[PDB]
């Protein structure tokens, strides 16, 4: 299902996290945000994973 | 201005955002009257706050 964009204004978040497997050729530093029905991982560039 | 600067300096030294108005009394040690006066005029955007 599609990521229900956070209409809730709080949304816990964590920062500084290397992801495995690598989205690109090498690891990508990013942050994580807990959404209403899932997590969204956003790299420093802008790669969004749900 | 004197109290505003003092409050901002305390916040910078703590290196933490004003998560709640109760912080003004706990960590900032603001007086009861000063708190009663300046409580309903300090917005704490919980939307942009995110994590505590």
UniProtKB/Swiss-Prot annotation, chain A:
Localization annotation: Nucleus; Chromosome
Tissue: Ubiquitous.
Phosphoserine modified-residue sites: 2, 10
UniProt superkingdom: Eukaryota
Membership in a protein family: Belongs to the peptidase M24 family. SPT16 subfamily.
Recorded domain comment: The C-terminal Glu-rich acidic region is essential for FACT activity.
Subunit structure: Interacts with MYOG (via C-terminal region). Component of the FACT complex, a stable heterodimer of SSRP1 and SUPT16H. Also a component of a CK2-SPT16-SSRP1 complex which forms following UV irradiation, composed of SSRP1, SUPT16H, CSNK2A1, CSNK2A2 and CSNK2B. Interacts with NEK9. Binds to histone H2A-H2B. Identified in a centromere complex containing histones H2A, H2B and H4, and at least CENPA, CENPB, CENPC, CENPT, CENPN, HJURP, SUPT16H, SSRP1 and RSF1. Interacts with GTF2E2.
Protein name (record): FACT complex subunit SPT16
Gene: SUPT16H
Residues shown, of full length: 649 to 698 of 1047
UniProtKB/Swiss-Prot annotation, chain B:
Tissues expressing the protein: Ubiquitously expressed.
Top-level lineage group: Eukaryota
Disulfide topology: none
Subcellular localization: Nucleus
Role of this protein: Histone H3-H4 chaperone that plays a key role in the regulation of transcription elongation and mRNA processing. Enhances the transcription elongation by RNA polymerase II (RNAPII) and is also required for the efficient activation of transcriptional elongation by the HIV-1 nuclear transcriptional activator, Tat. Besides chaperoning histones in transcription, acts to transport and splice mRNA by forming a complex with IWS1 and the C-terminal domain (CTD) of the RNAPII subunit RPB1 (POLR2A).
Assigned protein family: Belongs to the SPT6 family.
Subunit architecture: Interacts with RNA polymerase II and the DRB sensitivity-inducing factor complex (DSIF complex), which is composed of SUPT5H and SUPT4H1. Interacts with KDM6A. Interacts (via SH2 domain) with SETD1A. Interacts (via SH2 domain) with POLR2A phosphorylated at 'Ser-2'. Interacts with IWS1, AICDA and PAAF1. Interacts with histone H2B and H3. Interacts with WDR43. (Microbial infection) Interacts with human cytomegalovirus/HHV-5 protein UL69.
Name of the protein: Transcription elongation factor SPT6
Biological source species: Homo sapiens (Human)
Gene name of the record: SUPT6H
Portion of the parent chain present: 994 to 1045 of 1726
């Amino acid at each position: 299902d599609s990521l229900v964009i956070n209409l809730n204004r709080s949304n816990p978040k964590l920062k500084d996290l290397y992801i495995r497997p690598n989205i690109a050729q090498k690891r990508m530093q990013g942050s994580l945000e807990a959404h209403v029905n899932g997590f969204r991982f956003t790299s420093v560039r802008g790669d969004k994973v749900d | 201005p004197r109290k505003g600067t003092h409050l901002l300096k305390i916040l910078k030294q703590n290196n933490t955002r004003l998560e709640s108005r109760t912080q003004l009394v706990t960590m900032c040690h603001m007086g009861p009257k000063v708190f009663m006066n300046c409580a309903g005029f300090l917005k704490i955007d919980t939307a942009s706050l995110g994590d505590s």
